[PDB]
Design a protein around this ligand. Structure first.
Ligand SMILES: N[C@@H](CCC(=O)N[C@@H](CS)C(=O)NCC(=O)O)C(=O)O
Lengths: 203, 202
């Protein structure tokens, strides 16, 4: 198995940590969809990261679909997802919120770095920034109501939430202030000291 | 169950058709993340469509996660996904390509409508347009290799691919030449005449 993409992308990182958490060995090819376009295009012409090349050479994209494939390959015993409806529903909500925070953080990065200042649109940044704040706000309320376990093991919500938070702090820190979203920050900083996160640095 | 969003969004439409295909009843609330921002924000502060409000009131977002939840409620017998690894791998590859097509199509729409002319960036549109072509090119090769069944039934790949194609032709047709991707076009046009697609207009 081969994971194509840079770990500074939260989508690539959540897959990398999911792979390790599921016990599936793999090769990591650190390629950028922007600075090594041709090299990435040679593997996946759609040029989307993460891209997973399976044992037979099949190419997959989209972090959630890649993880669905990995979950299938690993078997139910290793699932990072609860199966009971209530519990799974909650997990899906947390992952959804975390992925929304990822999407909005990335949209801000793209708006500011992929086009000249003159073409940057204030109303767009305002909207996206508000959505980013809402996402972490919802996550904060969920965690304040029901804290995540800190037992050395991780579920998809924990992985995705930690990866998302650390990414936002690295790339769009100007959207945050010290002490903000204490529950989310607290869990992310706890997760970042777990062996699997330490072995998969974003940078 | 309540589905919040407009069917012109391929992400919302894929969920709507998945719901019907899984046999799960639901209420459809046709709300726009743009023209009815506040109303949508009151239901989901993040303002992302589709949003699914569960029986208990829980709010879920992201079409793939929503469908995962729905697959769970519906049970294995109703699954729109193959379980055997080789077949599930292919299905996931097809869905991934379809969603990539949706993403790039939406990005072109956003670039051309959420900012005035002088804010539009040509290099970005050219990049995204190229990725859109690549997504359907890959899908076309997959279909030529193994055609999709036309027995009135649908899998997630079929639903997502058809919704993606129809969306692209409706919103960014200027990116396509008529003879391109005949197998993809062919399947989408077949699917659109199926009862579930006719009962769920975009
Ligand atoms: N739904 C995808 C989103 C991945 C994504 O937007 N990746 C970025 C890197 S952070 C990218 O490939 N940008 C290249 C492009 O869209 O041109 C996932 O969860 O993998």
């Amino acid at each position: 198995l081969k994971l194509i993409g840079m770990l500074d992308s939260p989508y690539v990182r959540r897959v990398a940590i999911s792979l390790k958490s599921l016990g599936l060995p793999f090769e990591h090819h650190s390629l950028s969809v922007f600075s090594t376009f041709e090299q990435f295009k040679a593997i996946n012409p759609v040029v989307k990261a993460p891209t997973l090349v399976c044992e037979g050479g099949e190419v997959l994209m989209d972090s959630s679909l890649i993880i669905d494939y990995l979950e299938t390959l690993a078997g139910p015993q290793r699932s990072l997802m609860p199966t009971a409806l209530p519990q799974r529903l909650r997990e899906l909500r947390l992952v959804g919120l975390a992925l929304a925070a990822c999407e909005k953080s990335v949209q801000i990065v793209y708006e500011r770095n992929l086009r000249p200042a003159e073409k940057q649109h204030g109303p767009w940044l305002e909207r996206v920034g508000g959505q980013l704040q809402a996402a972490y706000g919802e996550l904060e309320q969920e965690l304040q109501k029901q804290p995540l376990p800190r037992d050395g093991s991780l579920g998809q919500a924990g992985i995705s939430l930690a990866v998302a938070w650390s990414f936002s702090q690295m790339m769009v820190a100007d959207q945050f202030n010290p002490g903000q979203f204490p529950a989310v920050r607290g869990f992310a900083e706890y997760a970042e000291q777990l062996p699997v996160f330490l072995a998969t640095p974003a940078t």
